[PDB]
RNA sequence: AUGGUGAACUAUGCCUGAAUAGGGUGAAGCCAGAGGAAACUCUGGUGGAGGCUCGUAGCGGUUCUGACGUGCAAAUCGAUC
RNA sequence: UUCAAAUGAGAACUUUGAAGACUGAAGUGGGGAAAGGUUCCACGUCAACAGCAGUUGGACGUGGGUUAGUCGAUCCUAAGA
RNA sequence: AUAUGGAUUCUUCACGGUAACGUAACUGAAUGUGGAGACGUCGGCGCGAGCCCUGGGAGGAGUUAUCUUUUCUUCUUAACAGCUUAUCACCCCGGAAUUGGUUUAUCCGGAGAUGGGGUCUUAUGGCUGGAAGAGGCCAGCACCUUUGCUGGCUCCGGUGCGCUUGUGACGGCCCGUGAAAAUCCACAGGAAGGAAUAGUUUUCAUGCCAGGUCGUACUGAUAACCGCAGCAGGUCUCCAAGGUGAACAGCCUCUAGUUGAUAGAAUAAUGUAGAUAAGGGAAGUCGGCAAAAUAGAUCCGUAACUUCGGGAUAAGGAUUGGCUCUAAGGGUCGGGUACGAUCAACUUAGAACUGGUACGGACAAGGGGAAUCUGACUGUCUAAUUAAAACAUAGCAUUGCGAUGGUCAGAAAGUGAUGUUGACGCAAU
C-alpha cells in the first residue's frame, strides 16, 4: 500500500512551507535518518546522533562526518588529496 | 529487628553481657489446615537489635523457658 | 476514596519529593517519601553497568562491606572483565611486538 | 512566615508584647495625662511592614 | 469436600417471656430457607429442629449464618417482635435471641 | 537643572523548578499478498509523524458596540469567542 | 431555606435536634509555598466593628499554646554577586 | 572512643568457581585513574504500588404490606531486618543456508545465532522477624465517679485495553542533543608495616559515649495575602470515589465540608437575566447586529482547485429506545520419543418481538455553499476605546569583517559585549 505519491517522510509538514522547501528537506532528512555501513566492523549500523556525529550500533565507534550524511563529498576529495600528497614525502 | 532459629546460638545471646530484658509471648495459631496449637516467641532485647526465637513446639518451649538465666529479667506475656 | 498529603513542607513535585502511598497498621493511607533511585555503576572503559557490584546512592557505599564493591579479578569493581581480557591480550602482544621491532631494527643498524 | 528567621520572630514577639491596653493604674498617677493607649495596633487594620 | 454446618439459636430468654413462640418460628425457617432457588427444596440438604428452647439448623447446601440472621429478622419483623428482640452472635456461629 | 530611589507591575535575556481531560487525522520504517515478457506497478495490514486538527483546564481577549457605568471592580461580570 | 428545644433582658441571625438542599473529589474536601503574625486555643464578653441583627466572630478582655541527631535551614554549587 | 568473639598467618597479607562470579571477614602511603552525584521530550508495549470492581465466610447495621440467601459496612500491617525474587547484561558447552531466532513496533548471529546449561544488578514482589501485644469490628457484664472488667472474631479468594502514579526494555525528534559543585565509593600503584612461641587484622559480628543553634501555632483565601475593606478581581502547588459517557466534560451521588451572602409583604410601569409565538421569512438594519438553525456516533455518499500533503465532518443522505435471541473473537494444564478439560472477559455484527414513530429523548454537541480584497501559514502587540491587512517568520537578496579585525559599550583604564566565538562565522539592512 504505497502511502503517498511523493512527499515521503515530508508528509508530516502537510501543506505548509511550499513544495520546493519541502523537496529540499526530504533530500537531506532521507540522508540523516538513513542507516549506514560501518567502515570498521562491516555491519550497516551507523545512524546519526546530532549534526556531524555518526556512531555505530554494535562495536560503538563514532566517526565525525557531514552534517546530514556520513561522508561529505568535499572531505572525500580531501582524503584522496592527503593520500596523494603523503605519497610524495615517503617516496 | 532480627529473628533466630539455632536454639543454642540463642542460648548464648541470653547471656550476652548487655542483655537485661527478655519477653515470652504466647499465641494461639492453627496447624496445616485442621487443628490449632501453641506458638511461643522468645524475645531477647539486645542493645542494638531485638532478637526473637520462635519455638513452634509447646514441649520444646516449656523446657527452654526453665533454662532461661536466673538473673535475666524476663517479662512473661 | 481516601486521599493523602505531603510530609515535608515543600509542596511541589520535584525529583527529591517523590511520594508513595501505603497502608498502615492503623488501617489508613499515608504518604511516604521515596529517595531518588540508585543507578548502576559503570565500567569506566566500555561503559556498561558493571556486574557483581551492588547499587546504592554514593554516600551509602561507605556503609557497606567491600565485597559489595568489587569482583575478585584485577580491575575488579572498576572495568568489565571482557574489557580486562582485552587489556591482558593487548598488553602481552604489544610488549612482544615491542621486542620484535627491536631486534629487527637492531639487525638493520648492523645490515646496511 | 511559616518558616521564619529569628530576626523576624524576635520582632514579632516584641510586637505582641506592646499589644495591650493601658494599665489602668497609670490613669491614677498625679497629673497623669495619658488617657488610653494611642499606639495600639491590630493585625487586620495596620500591617507592620516587616 | 461436602461439609455439614450446624447453627444454634438460644431462643430461651424471650421464649421464657411469652412473646416468642419457637413453634411457628422454626416453621418460618422450615419453609422459607431457599435452596439453589426456592423454598422447601431442603431435600434433606438442610434440616431444622427445636431442642425445646434451642433451634438447630444443619446445612449441606449454600447456607451462611448471615442468611440466618436475615430470615429471623423477617420473622421478627413479621410478628411485631422487633423492638424487643435482637438476633445476636455470642460465640462464633452460636446465636441467641436477646430480650429487654 | 542638580542629586538621588525604583524591574513586588510589566518588557527582554539568563539560572533552577513545575504544569497541560478526552477525541479526529494516519507521515517515514516494517510485514504479507497480487499483476507483469520485462521495466515495474498494485493491494491489505503494521506502525505512530506533525510550530496538524476537535476541544477542556490553561493562556488569550472577538462580538453583543450585552451587564455595570456615584460599579463587586480606578478594567470587573455574563454569554459568545 | 424550614420546624422545635435550649440559652438570654432581648433570638429571622447563637447552640443543639429534626427536615430540605449545596459543593460533587479539576471541591464549598485534606495540606502546603509566598505573604500575614497570634488571626490558633480557652475562658469571660458586646461600647465600638462584622453597611439588618447579634446572646455569635478573624471583634473586645484575660490567659494558654509552637518540644527534632533523622523535617527544613545550616553544606554545595547555577545565572550571578 | 574501644575491647570481646570471628576471620587471617609456620606457603605471612582469604579461599572457592573452567568462567561470567562467589563471601561474614580477608593489610595498602604518596600518586594516578574510573564510577556515582548527573540530568531532554514525546510514543506505544511490559511490570509494581495504591485505587476501582467482585465470590465465599465471620460480624454489626438498614428495608421488609409485598419482593430481595438482600442493601450498607468491618476484615488492616510501618520503617527496618533475614531468606528469596529481574527485564537487561554476561559466561560455558556448541558451530548455524533449507538461514534461524524474534518485538505491538524489524532487529540480531562466524566480531559465534538458535539450543542447553550457569553468573549478575534487587526496581519490585513474596514468606518470616517487627507484629498482634497495635489497630479495626462485635458481644457480654459492672456504676455519679477515674470509668473500667470480661471475653469473642480480625479468615480464603477472583477479575483487567480500568484509574492514578511509579518504573523497565524499546522507538520518534533536533542547524534544539537537553547544569554545576560539594560529596561517597572503586581501581591501578606498592611506600611501608606485619608471625610460630606467637603476630597482623576494625570495610565481619557484637559492645560504649555524643549529636549543638534557629523555624515548627494558624490562614493560604467570595473574611487571616495584594487590591484604602471581611472588594464577584488578583495570587505557585500535591492528594482525588460511584454511575452515565470517548472522557479529569456536563448532570446525579458516597466521604468530608457547607447551608455563609439584611429581612417581611405585593407582583404596576420601565427594566436586567431566562423562554415561546399563527402566516410571511431579512421586507428590519450601515451591516442578519442579535437570535434561530446545525451538532454525538454507525453506515452510504462527497465538487472546483491543489504546492499531491489537501480541499473534507466538503456538500448530501439513512440510521440510533426497550426487550429477547444468535454467531465470531481468548487463558491454563497433563498427551510415545486427532481431541479432551475447565476458568474468565465487553467488543462487534446479525435476527426477532415491542411502543401514540419514540429513541446522541436531559446533559453533551460544527451551519453550509459560490466569490472579490488582503496577509502565505502556526506565532506577536497598543494592560485600561485599535488584534488588523499592522509586527515576526521561514524563504530571497544586499553590506561589513582574517583578530594589529568588524559592530557595539565606557569618564577613564593592565576596561567591556559578540567571544567557551573564526566566514557553514559574527555584526548590519
Ligand atoms: Mg468500600
Ligand atoms: Mg506539613
Ligand atoms: Mg518531569
Ligand atoms: Mg553482591
Ligand atoms: Mg561483589
Ligand atoms: Mg489586607
Ligand atoms: Mg519580576
Ligand atoms: Mg492528552
Ligand atoms: Mg470528536
Ligand atoms: Mg490532542
Ligand atoms: Mg507472477
Ligand atoms: Mg498523534
Ligand atoms: Mg496547533
Ligand atoms: Mg485547534
Ligand atoms: Mg468534545
Ligand atoms: Mg478563562
Ligand atoms: Mg495566546
Ligand atoms: Mg458595552
Ligand atoms: Mg445606572
Ligand atoms: Mg468579557
Ligand atoms: Mg473555547
Ligand atoms: Mg438567615
Ligand atoms: Mg448536587
Ligand atoms: Mg467536574
Ligand atoms: Mg463558602
Ligand atoms: Mg495549615
Ligand atoms: Mg494574617
Ligand atoms: Mg494573646
Ligand atoms: Mg477561633
Ligand atoms: Mg451593642
Ligand atoms: Mg471587623
Ligand atoms: Mg451591622
Ligand atoms: Mg448593633
Ligand atoms: Mg483575644
Ligand atoms: Mg535530610
Ligand atoms: Mg549548622
Ligand atoms: Mg574464609
Ligand atoms: Mg572524579
Ligand atoms: Mg562522571
Ligand atoms: Mg539537575
Ligand atoms: Mg526509611
Ligand atoms: Mg538461559
Ligand atoms: Mg555452566
Ligand atoms: Mg493490550
Ligand atoms: Mg496529576
Ligand atoms: Mg540522548
Ligand atoms: Mg562505586
Ligand atoms: Mg621510602
Ligand atoms: Mg563495623
Ligand atoms: Mg563544632
Ligand atoms: Mg502545622
Ligand atoms: Mg478562611
Ligand atoms: Mg494599607
Ligand atoms: Mg476578593
Ligand atoms: Mg474549611
Ligand atoms: Mg450583598
Ligand atoms: Mg425583598
Ligand atoms: Mg413566526
Ligand atoms: Mg423559508
Ligand atoms: Mg432572499
Ligand atoms: Mg435592505
Ligand atoms: Mg457596510
Ligand atoms: Mg451573531
Ligand atoms: Mg424552534
Ligand atoms: Mg468548501
Ligand atoms: Mg431497533
Ligand atoms: Mg462464545
Ligand atoms: Mg440479510
Ligand atoms: Mg496572518
Ligand atoms: Mg493566527
Ligand atoms: Mg487598547
Ligand atoms: Mg495610553
Ligand atoms: Mg486575532
Ligand atoms: Mg479589543
Ligand atoms: Mg510584514
Ligand atoms: Mg517569494
Ligand atoms: Mg593602564
Ligand atoms: Zn561497527
Coordinates of N, CA and C (backbone and C1' of nucleotides) in Angstrom, one line a residue, chain E residues 5 7 34-37 62-67 69-70 73-74 77-78 82 86 88-90 92-93 95-96, chain H residues 55-74 138-141 151-153:
Chain E
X5 N -22.9 -28.1 58.3 CA -22.8 -26.9 59.1 C -24.0 -26.7 60.0
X7 N -25.9 -24.8 63.4 CA -26.2 -23.4 63.7 C -27.2 -23.2 64.8
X34 N -34.3 -20.8 51.4 CA -34.3 -21.2 50.0 C -33.1 -22.0 49.6
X35 N -33.2 -23.0 48.7 CA -32.1 -23.8 48.3 C -31.9 -23.9 46.8
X36 N -30.7 -23.6 46.3 CA -30.4 -23.4 44.9 C -31.7 -22.9 44.2
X37 N -32.4 -21.9 44.8 CA -33.6 -21.4 44.2 C -34.7 -21.0 45.1
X62 N -25.5 -24.3 50.0 CA -25.1 -22.9 50.3 C -26.0 -22.3 51.3
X63 N -25.5 -22.2 52.6 CA -26.2 -21.5 53.7 C -25.2 -20.8 54.6
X64 N -25.3 -19.5 54.6 CA -24.5 -18.7 55.6 C -25.3 -18.2 56.8
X65 N -24.6 -18.1 57.9 CA -25.2 -17.6 59.2 C -25.7 -16.2 59.1
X66 N -25.2 -15.4 58.1 CA -25.8 -14.1 57.8 C -27.2 -14.3 57.3
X67 N -27.4 -15.3 56.5 CA -28.8 -15.7 56.0 C -29.7 -16.0 57.1
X69 N -29.6 -14.8 60.3 CA -29.9 -13.6 60.9 C -30.9 -12.8 60.0
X70 N -30.8 -13.0 58.7 CA -31.6 -12.3 57.7 C -33.0 -12.9 57.7
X73 N -35.0 -11.9 61.2 CA -35.3 -10.5 61.2 C -36.6 -10.4 60.5
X74 N -36.8 -11.1 59.5 CA -38.1 -11.0 58.7 C -39.2 -11.5 59.6
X77 N -39.7 -9.2 62.3 CA -40.5 -8.0 61.8 C -41.9 -8.4 61.4
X78 N -42.1 -9.6 61.0 CA -43.4 -10.1 60.6 C -44.4 -10.1 61.8
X82 N -39.8 -7.2 66.6 CA -38.6 -6.3 66.5 C -39.0 -5.1 67.3
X86 N -33.3 -8.7 69.7 CA -32.1 -8.8 68.7 C -31.8 -10.2 68.4
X88 N -28.5 -12.0 67.8 CA -27.1 -11.7 68.1 C -26.2 -12.9 68.1
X89 N -24.9 -12.7 67.6 CA -23.9 -13.7 67.8 C -23.3 -13.6 69.2
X90 N -23.0 -14.7 69.8 CA -22.3 -14.8 71.1 C -20.9 -15.3 70.8
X92 N -18.8 -17.9 68.2 CA -18.9 -17.9 66.7 C -19.9 -19.0 66.3
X93 N -20.8 -18.6 65.3 CA -21.8 -19.5 64.8 C -22.9 -19.9 65.8
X95 N -25.8 -18.5 67.9 CA -26.5 -17.2 68.0 C -27.5 -17.3 69.1
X96 N -28.0 -16.1 69.6 CA -29.1 -16.1 70.6 C -30.0 -14.9 70.4
Chain H
rG55 P -20.2 -10.0 44.9 O5' -19.7 -11.5 45.1 C5' -19.7 -12.3 44.0 C4' -19.1 -13.7 44.3 C3' -19.3 -14.2 45.7 O3' -20.6 -14.7 45.9 C1' -17.0 -14.5 45.1
rG56 P -21.2 -14.5 47.4 O5' -20.3 -15.5 48.3 C5' -20.2 -16.9 48.0 C4' -19.2 -17.6 48.8 C3' -19.3 -17.5 50.3 O3' -20.4 -18.4 50.8 C1' -17.1 -17.2 49.8
rG57 P -21.3 -17.9 52.0 O5' -20.3 -17.7 53.2 C5' -20.0 -18.9 54.0 C4' -18.9 -18.5 55.0 C3' -19.2 -17.7 56.2 O3' -19.8 -18.5 57.3 C1' -17.3 -16.8 55.2
rA58 P -20.9 -17.9 58.3 O5' -20.0 -16.9 59.2 C5' -18.8 -17.4 59.9 C4' -18.1 -16.3 60.6 C3' -18.9 -15.3 61.3 O3' -19.5 -15.7 62.5 C1' -17.2 -14.2 60.0
rG59 P -21.0 -15.3 62.9 O5' -21.0 -13.8 62.6 C5' -21.6 -12.8 63.4 C4' -20.8 -11.6 63.7 C3' -21.5 -10.3 63.8 O3' -22.3 -10.1 65.0 C1' -19.7 -10.0 62.4
rG60 P -23.8 -9.9 65.0 O5' -23.9 -8.3 64.7 C5' -23.5 -7.4 65.8 C4' -23.3 -6.0 65.2 C3' -24.5 -5.3 64.5 O3' -25.4 -4.8 65.4 C1' -22.6 -5.1 63.2
rA61 P -27.0 -4.9 65.0 O5' -27.1 -3.9 63.8 C5' -27.5 -2.6 64.1 C4' -27.1 -1.7 63.0 C3' -28.2 -1.5 61.9 O3' -29.1 -0.5 62.2 C1' -26.2 -2.1 60.9
rG62 P -30.7 -0.8 62.5 O5' -31.4 -0.6 61.1 C5' -31.3 0.7 60.6 C4' -31.4 0.7 59.1 C3' -32.7 0.1 58.5 O3' -33.7 1.1 58.5 C1' -30.8 -0.6 57.3
rU63 P -35.2 0.6 58.9 O5' -35.7 -0.1 57.5 C5' -35.8 0.7 56.3 C4' -36.2 -0.2 55.2 C3' -37.3 -1.2 55.6 O3' -38.6 -0.7 55.6 C1' -35.6 -2.3 54.4
rU64 P -39.6 -1.1 56.8 O5' -40.1 -2.6 56.4 C5' -40.9 -2.8 55.3 C4' -40.7 -4.2 54.8 C3' -41.4 -5.3 55.7 O3' -42.8 -5.4 55.5 C1' -39.2 -6.0 55.0
rA65 P -43.8 -4.7 56.5 O5' -45.2 -4.8 55.8 C5' -46.3 -5.5 56.3 C4' -47.3 -5.8 55.2 C3' -46.8 -6.7 54.1 O3' -46.9 -8.0 54.4 C1' -47.9 -4.8 53.2
rU66 P -45.5 -8.9 54.2 O5' -45.4 -9.2 52.7 C5' -46.5 -9.4 51.8 C4' -46.2 -8.9 50.4 C3' -44.9 -9.3 49.9 O3' -44.8 -10.6 49.4 C1' -45.3 -7.0 49.4
rC67 P -43.7 -11.6 50.1 O5' -42.5 -11.4 49.1 C5' -42.6 -11.5 47.7 C4' -41.5 -10.9 46.9 C3' -40.1 -11.2 47.4 O3' -39.6 -12.4 47.0 C1' -40.3 -8.9 46.9
rU68 P -38.4 -13.2 47.7 O5' -37.2 -12.2 47.6 C5' -36.5 -12.1 46.4 C4' -35.3 -11.2 46.5 C3' -34.2 -11.6 47.6 O3' -33.4 -12.7 47.2 C1' -34.7 -9.3 47.7
rU69 P -33.1 -13.8 48.3 O5' -31.5 -13.7 48.5 C5' -31.0 -13.2 49.8 C4' -30.0 -14.1 50.4 C3' -28.7 -14.3 49.7 O3' -27.8 -13.3 50.0 C1' -29.6 -16.4 50.6
rU70 P -27.3 -12.3 48.9 O5' -28.1 -11.0 49.0 C5' -28.8 -10.5 48.0 C4' -29.7 -9.3 48.4 C3' -29.0 -8.1 48.8 O3' -28.7 -7.3 47.6 C1' -30.6 -8.6 50.4
rU71 P -27.3 -6.7 47.4 O5' -27.4 -5.2 48.0 C5' -28.4 -4.4 47.6 C4' -28.5 -3.2 48.5 C3' -27.1 -2.8 49.1 O3' -26.4 -1.9 48.3 C1' -28.7 -3.0 50.9
rC72 P -24.8 -2.1 48.3 O5' -24.4 -1.5 49.7 C5' -24.5 -0.1 50.0 C4' -24.3 0.3 51.4 C3' -23.0 0.0 52.1 O3' -21.9 0.9 51.8 C1' -24.8 -0.6 53.5
rU73 P -20.5 0.3 51.6 O5' -19.9 0.0 53.0 C5' -19.8 1.0 54.0 C4' -19.6 0.5 55.4 C3' -18.4 -0.5 55.6 O3' -17.3 0.2 55.8 C1' -20.4 -1.5 56.4
rU74 P -15.9 -0.4 55.3 O5' -15.3 -1.2 56.6 C5' -15.4 -0.8 57.9 C4' -15.0 -1.9 58.8 C3' -13.9 -2.9 58.3 O3' -12.6 -2.4 58.5 C1' -15.7 -4.1 59.3
rC138 P -19.3 -2.3 64.8 O5' -19.7 -3.8 65.3 C5' -20.0 -4.1 66.7 C4' -20.1 -5.6 67.0 C3' -20.6 -6.0 68.3 O3' -22.0 -6.0 68.4 C1' -18.6 -7.1 67.8
rA139 P -22.7 -5.4 69.6 O5' -23.1 -6.7 70.5 C5' -23.1 -8.0 70.0 C4' -22.6 -9.1 71.0 C3' -23.0 -8.8 72.4 O3' -24.3 -9.2 72.8 C1' -20.7 -9.3 72.2
rG140 P -25.0 -8.5 74.1 O5' -24.3 -9.2 75.3 C5' -24.3 -10.6 75.6 C4' -23.3 -10.9 76.7 C3' -23.6 -10.2 78.0 O3' -24.6 -10.8 78.8 C1' -21.3 -10.0 77.4
rC141 P -25.6 -9.8 79.6 O5' -24.6 -8.7 80.3 C5' -24.8 -8.3 81.6 C4' -23.6 -8.6 82.4 C3' -23.4 -7.8 83.7 O3' -24.1 -8.3 84.8 C1' -21.4 -7.7 82.5
rG151 P -10.7 -12.4 79.4 O5' -10.9 -13.8 78.6 C5' -11.2 -13.7 77.2 C4' -12.7 -13.8 77.0 C3' -13.2 -13.9 75.5 O3' -13.0 -15.2 75.0 C1' -14.5 -12.4 76.6
rG152 P -11.6 -15.6 74.3 O5' -12.0 -16.0 72.9 C5' -12.2 -15.0 71.9 C4' -13.6 -15.1 71.3 C3' -13.7 -14.7 69.9 O3' -13.5 -15.9 69.0 C1' -15.1 -13.3 71.0
rC153 P -12.1 -16.4 68.6 O5' -12.0 -16.1 67.0 C5' -13.2 -16.1 66.2 C4' -13.5 -14.8 65.5 C3' -12.4 -14.3 64.6 O3' -12.2 -15.0 63.4 C1' -13.6 -12.5 65.7

